[PDB]
Design a protein around this ligand. Sequence first.
Ligand SMILES: CC(C)C[C@H](NP(=O)(O)CNC(=O)OCc1ccccc1)C(=O)N[C@@H](C)C(=O)O
Ligand SMILES: [Ca+2]
Ligand SMILES: [Ca+2]
Ligand SMILES: [Ca+2]
Ligand SMILES: [Ca+2]
Ligand SMILES: [Zn+2]
Length: 316
Amino acid sequence: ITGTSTVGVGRGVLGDQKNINTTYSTYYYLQDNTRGNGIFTYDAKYRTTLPGSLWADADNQFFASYDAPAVDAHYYAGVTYDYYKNVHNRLSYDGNNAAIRSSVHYSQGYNNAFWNGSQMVYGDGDGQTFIPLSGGIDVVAHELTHAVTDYTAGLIYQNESGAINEAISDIFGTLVEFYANKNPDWEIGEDVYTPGISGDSLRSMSDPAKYGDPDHYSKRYTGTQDNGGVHINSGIINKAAYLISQGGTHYGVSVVGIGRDKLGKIFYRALTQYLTPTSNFSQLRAAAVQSATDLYGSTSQEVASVKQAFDAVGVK
Ligand SMILES: CC(C)C[C@H](NP(=O)(O)CNC(=O)OCc1ccccc1)C(=O)N[C@@H](C)C(=O)O
Ligand SMILES: [Ca+2]
Ligand SMILES: [Ca+2]
Ligand SMILES: [Ca+2]
Ligand SMILES: [Ca+2]
Ligand SMILES: [Zn+2]
């Protein structure tokens, strides 16, 4: 909408106060004009028609319980935009400052979030498996990263290419969580998963097997559930990424860590310059090795560590 840029204040899902960029024209709208061609947050009103209504508020204060998922979807989309722009020189998900749209309060008791081809969508959860999913910065960044993937490598959402697609979203979700630097970890969704259980998460990158996901190619799932295991087999690539950054010895194979920033550079380059819609895990290894070679040189520690990490998870 046409209006003037304003700054509202509210509380997110976890009870924390933050400022948000809004637009005033009669109402205050969740429309942040400070980033690209805008970040827009919508109310789906517990229904499944999308996007729903651009979020309108009378007073620019967003402290109601109903407001909290919108505050966080809006704010964390901003953080994710900033990460891609500042760290990777990428302007929004399409590289040309496409408007970023999110809807919250999608459906009833909805234990998921997704990119629908055009926008992000967040359930409220059922209060048992999830609370409103936009409360997780890693979740928001995971979702926006699906848009980045779709505009770049285009990894098909099934089997190995789909597990790479998933791991890319977990990797960048985590790197955005570290970028914001509030309780960062290598777990996925911990801030919004199972409010009645402390210390767990939906997935772990550092130890995927903790939540039943494979950490070695020999343990890959090859059945048909979950689009051929895209959220399961992602553990193999998540573990490799974790090892590249943090190091470790895994099934006897030692990896020298090179840190998060270099992990991100290597994988961003792989995603945008080498991966294709049909890439498999072996092809990801080759893309990561080539990306590290481009950035750091063939004889570098960075290249050596990429190879060690893929060796450690059984991907040649
Ligand atoms: C980071 C978490 C909290 C959310 C994350 N959601 P996601 O974006 O991977 C869900 N994916 C999804 O709905 O894909 C199906 C789809 C939906 C619309 C268009 C095309 C394909 C996830 O791991 N979801 C798990 C629970 C799952 O779907 O198994
Ligand atoms: Ca208000
Ligand atoms: Ca965390
Ligand atoms: Ca996390
Ligand atoms: Ca929990
Ligand atoms: Zn995903």
